[model samples]
Target: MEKLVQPTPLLLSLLKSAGAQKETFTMKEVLYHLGQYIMAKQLYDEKQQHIVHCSNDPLGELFGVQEFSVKEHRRIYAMISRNLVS
Candidate 1:
């Protein structure tokens, strides 16, 4: 089990600033905004498959945001493809 960690003041501030206007956001978008403050870490299982985990602030959920939406996933993929070609 993973332990929950509190967000830093900068993280909290950014969330509030973004959450003020948008009710929902993709994990990529959030991390993009967070920049160096947060990052995703990958771990490999016994089978040698990698799992992705985002470093999150537990308080983020309290602000009424949810993750892993189909729309958000599409948006992230589109953004990635666009950036890659650009």
Candidate 2:
């Protein structure tokens, strides 16, 4: 498995505490948001893997990719997340 060199130390530790070991993965939305922060742009990972922010901070996005044309997408956005895809 590839070493996790992208996430910050705090993130790595958090994941570790959560039992994310041996190359386990997170949601697509979660990965997307983290990638967004790292790249500092709107570009998301092509794999459609989203990185959800599990915390209650105002900046946390949720799992799954979102397209505004769908009714579910609109509903999800209203709750607790933003979507990113590239």
Candidate 3:
């Protein structure tokens, strides 16, 4: 609908818990922000370019993924999105 993918309460809370302040994000915007956060924190795994090593944080707890794949971002997003493209 329109060109927006509204941020859900879960996402918003997660962002807030992770110390982010924003009204909301339209899917891609948040993903871009997350990508930026990852680099800023140097969360990327040393052994791989596409893999991010999540820690004891909001993002990590939500996905419960020890190692996250940026290229396979859809894998985690899939668990939450109620609307998206195939």
lDDT of each: 0.37, 0.37, 0.63
How high a TM-score does candidate 1 get? 0.23
27: Cα error in model 1, Å: 0.7
Local accuracy of candidate 2 as per-residue lDDT tens digits, 1-86: 44223333444443444444533234443344434443443333445434333344222333333321223444544432333221
Off by over 4 Å in 3: 1-3, 6-10, 13-21, 79-86
Show where candidate 1 strays beyond 4 Å.
1-13, 18-20, 36-86
Q: What is the lDDT of residue 19 in candidate 2?
A: 45
Q: After superposition, how far is residue 73 of candidate 2 from its true place, in Å?
A: 11
Candidate 2 residue pairs in clash (backbone atoms < 3 Å): 27-50, 28-49, 28-50, 28-51, 29-50, 29-51, 30-50, 30-51, 30-52, 31-51
Tell me the deviation in Å of residue 68 in model 1: 24
| Clash count list over all predictions | 0, 10, 0
Residues 4-82 of candidate 3: C-alpha lDDT, one tens digit per residue: 5555665556555446677456676666656666677678878888888878555675566677687785785774364
Q: Please give the lDDT score for candidate 3.
A: 0.63
- TM-scores of the models, in the given order? 0.23, 0.24, 0.64
- Candidates 1 and 3 compared by TM-score, better number: 3
Number of clashes found in candidate 2: 10
Better of 2 and 3 by lDDT: 3
